[PDB]
């Protein structure tokens, strides 16, 4: 067999979207290509330290490396070996480094319909913004619906012609012939799924607000429906947990309750820059979430220091928001912060917030203390630490907090 | 006649979508609701001074007021009277204050398919950005195509059912029944005309770069087609005026030529925040143009101080990017900078660049000297100037440069 499973660990379980994590959970990891090996092993070491510091020996992640990408191609001549897939379907939780699609395959096989993008100010880090201090949001992007379904046809195709003829005769819709055509689809079920995940996360992590991003004023039956369905499932399934903005400024009490409001897409691309502190959890459809994530991440410096995840009803894949950077591979120079942040997010989803908070804290202290990798040092005029050395600094710091 | 037309003026002409402006052009204006009267009259006074200072008495705008909105309702009991429509179809160029729609009606009747959004840094204003200095761009948004055509249907409508049945049997596309449906259309012709306008503007006003905004990597036949069609008309109709980014990093020289490149939408939402100086003219389809405009304008912070326009092959409507501000109506408090900026844009389209430059410099100087209205004075600890007084200050300044 290609893998030796830890006989000391147990798979993480799920009952209805909720992660039931054993004290010795088996968690998979994929090194990744290029800088993958260096940053991922660094992440694992940092994570193990946070878990031991926070919980002592009462908890311990039983890591199981699986192969994918170049490493897999060189070892067994298959970039996504059958055994790797089997371990994924079995343990369903993986921390994976950058890969040169394997990412799409993992998301599809584990049905990780939600893309999670936390973006929080990191003290010490330069920002294009004069006041990034209060940036603390998390984007919940539905990642299987919308125009990204790929239902589209070229302007000069027979398919497009059939659509145009159909729209004209059956719907009396006027459309010229020199037109490319895409079908935007918005599912009630898909909208409810992501909405539930967002509210449940708010409850579990003491988040105070969820904002629905939409262009419902013009895209009435797709994004406007998204908004409607989101409020609908929130009020029907999380009644005594949430309070709508239409209730606050109406009389209802929001004391100890999560505020559920909504904003027009165009306004959000504006406010994220002018006053990003207004947002906590952002709930949005596929396309909007894609664009708002890019803007939000730019609010802080170096997007390569952010982590993210794709979550499903029974599984999750956590990764850094950056590429393989083949130029620095094996040079012990890459910044492991991003993949470490993916680990922090993973810790939070597992309910191990104490270990996650220790990592967040150690990073803030390391960066404020100018103990950073080259990508940052080059700007704060100081000697850079290597990948391994930087990870070790985070470790010694956690040992004192 | 309801309107006494200036017997001394001449109408602006159009040749291949190029403005042929007489020395005494008739230009229509609509005061607008709320603060409209105060700011539009101030703009007219500043525009006339700029024209007088730059060309003496050799040129003079023959303004002609037409009614729309609440003033029209009171005077002729019609929000958009027939007489107003007649003047618009005749003179085709109008400076319009904010209105509480008339905006859509003017755009349709004059086929003003291009939404123009200039946004450049103004010396002295608060900015969310640490470095807004080199922000100097103009967004050219196709404003009649894309999802905004409104071809959409509710998930439980018989129309939506007809569409899903069609796609299933004729296209063999699988789609659930609980889905709202929108149709994204992208026209080759609509894309070409907006592209021609953008390049022609770059040529006319010595602009050096045009960047196409798109998500063609995932929306290949709509936005990807937009990109392809834009490059096509550019290379085919403006060959000796432009050079592509691909050609430059291929060996070709860009000396004396406008640069034409493209960027994926998500990348632009990032770069517009971290380094907006990279953009000059942004060419984009309806939806992207909408979102990018919001993000771009947020870079300077004072949205109410921006001007904009809708241009067609034979006309133009210029307006400020703000509402009627009823709370400030008739209190001589409103900031007229946005509508003046719209007037500055109108002068550039007219080819009267000297007058436009005067307005631009005067505003810069006024702000740098802290001679501003309350919306700005509030943050610089100086006494605010009224609407009339601020306009008069710009006028005394223009008499000096």
């Amino acid at each position: 067999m290609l893998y030796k499973e830890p006989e000391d660990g147990e798979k993480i379980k799920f009952d209805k979207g909720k992660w039931i994590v054993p004290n010795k959970p088996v968690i998979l990891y994929i090194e990744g290509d290029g800088i993958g090996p260096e940053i991922t092993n660094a992440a694992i070491k940092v994570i193990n330290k946070a878990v031991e510091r926070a919980y002592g020996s009462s908890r311990e992640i039983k890591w199981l490396e699986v192969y994918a990408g170049e490493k897999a191609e060189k070892l067994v001549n298959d970039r996504f070996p059958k055994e790797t897939q089997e371990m994924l379907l079995k343990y369903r939780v993986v921390l994976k480094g950058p890969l040169e699609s394997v990412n799409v395959a993992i998301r599809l096989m584990l049905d990780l319909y939600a893309n999670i993008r936390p973006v929080k100010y990191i003290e010490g880090l330069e920002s294009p913004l004069k006041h990034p201090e209060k940036v603390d949001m998390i984007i919940f992007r539905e990642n299987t619906d919308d125009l990204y379904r790929g239902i589209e046809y070229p302007f000069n195709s027979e398919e497009a012609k059939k659509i145009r003829d159909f729209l004209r005769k059956e719907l009396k819709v006027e459309i010229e012939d020199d037109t490319g055509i895409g079908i935007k689809v918005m599912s009630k079920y898909k909208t409810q799924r992501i909405t539930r995940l967002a509210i449940q996360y708010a409850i579990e992590h003491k988040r105070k607000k969820v904002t629905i991003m939409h262009k419902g004023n013009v895209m009435k039956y797709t994004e406007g429906a998204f908004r409607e369905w989101a409020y609908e499932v929130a009020l029907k399934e999380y009644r005594d947990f949430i309070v709508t903005e239409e209730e606050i400024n109406q009389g209802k009490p929001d004391q100890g309750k999560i505020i559920l409001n909504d904003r027009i897409a165009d306004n959000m691309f504006q406010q994220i820059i002018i006053r990003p502190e207004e947002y906590d959890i952002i709930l949005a459809p596929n396309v909007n979430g894609d664009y708002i994530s890019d803007a939000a991440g730019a609010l802080i410096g170096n997007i390569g220091m952010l982590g993210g995840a794709n979550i499903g009803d029974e599984g999750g894949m956590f990764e850094a928001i950056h590429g393989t950077a083949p130029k620095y591979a094996g040079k012990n120079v890459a910044n492991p912060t991003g993949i470490i942040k993916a680990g922090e997010l993973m810790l939070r989803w597992m309910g191990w917030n104490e270990a996650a908070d220790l990592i967040e804290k150690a990073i803030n202290m390391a960066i404020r203390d100018k103990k950073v990798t080259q990508d940052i040092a080059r700007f704060m005029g100081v000697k850079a630490l290597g990948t391994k050395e930087y990870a070790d600094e985070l470790i010694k710091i956690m040992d004192t907090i």
Side-chain angles (χ1 to χ4, degrees), chain A residues 85-104:
Chain A
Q85 305 180 201
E86 306 180 328
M87 294 299 278
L88 280 160
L89 293 176
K90 179 170 182 182
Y91 297 99
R92 323 183 67 79
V93 181
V94 182
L95 174 66
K96 54 156 286 293
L99 289 175
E100 304 284 40
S101 165
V102 174
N103 301 319
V104 60

Side-chain angles (χ1 to χ4, degrees), chain A residues 168-236:
Chain A
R168 292 172 188 165
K169 187 183 69 176
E170 298 299 309
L171 288 306
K172 300 192 176 184
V173 179
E174 299 173 58
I175 174 175
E176 332 85 272
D177 295 311
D178 71 354
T179 50
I181 297 179
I183 306 302
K184 184 186 172 73
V185 181
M186 202 102 285
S187 164
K188 174 173 188 176
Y189 173 65
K190 290 181 177 294
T191 298
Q192 303 173 315
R193 272 200 315 191
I194 183 76
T195 296
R196 290 176 183 127
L197 196 70
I199 297 167
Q200 299 178 315
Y201 183 94
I203 297 174
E204 288 178 46
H205 293 86
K206 293 295 190 65
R207 284 282 153 165
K208 44 71 176 188
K209 183 200 299 176
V210 175
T211 303
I212 302 160
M213 172 177 174
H214 66 86
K215 195 62 201 298
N217 63 308
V218 306
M219 293 180 230
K220 308 173 183 62
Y221 309 122
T222 49
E223 289 186 28
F226 184 91
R227 196 230 309 95
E228 192 195 74
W229 293 322
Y231 270 105
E232 183 193 308
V233 69
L235 277 52
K236 181 224 300 169

Side-chain angles (χ1 to χ4, degrees), chain A residues 23-41:
Chain A
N23 289 316
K24 290 183 164 50
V26 176
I27 293 181
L28 271 36
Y29 78 90
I30 290 171
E31 284 185 348
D33 299 325
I35 58 173
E38 313 181 271
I39 61 176
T40 302
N41 285 306

Side-chain angles (χ1 to χ4, degrees), chain A residues 50-63:
Chain A
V51 172
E52 182 231 69
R53 235 300 176 193
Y55 313 115
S57 59
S58 73
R59 288 175 165 178
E60 190 201 1
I61 295 173
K62 294 299 176 170
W63 302 91

Side-chain angles (χ1 to χ4, degrees), chain A residues 291-312:
Chain A
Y291 301 151
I292 201 64
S293 298
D294 306 306
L299 298 179
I300 63 173
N302 198 169
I303 302 175
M305 288 185 68
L306 293 171
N310 268 86
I311 288 71

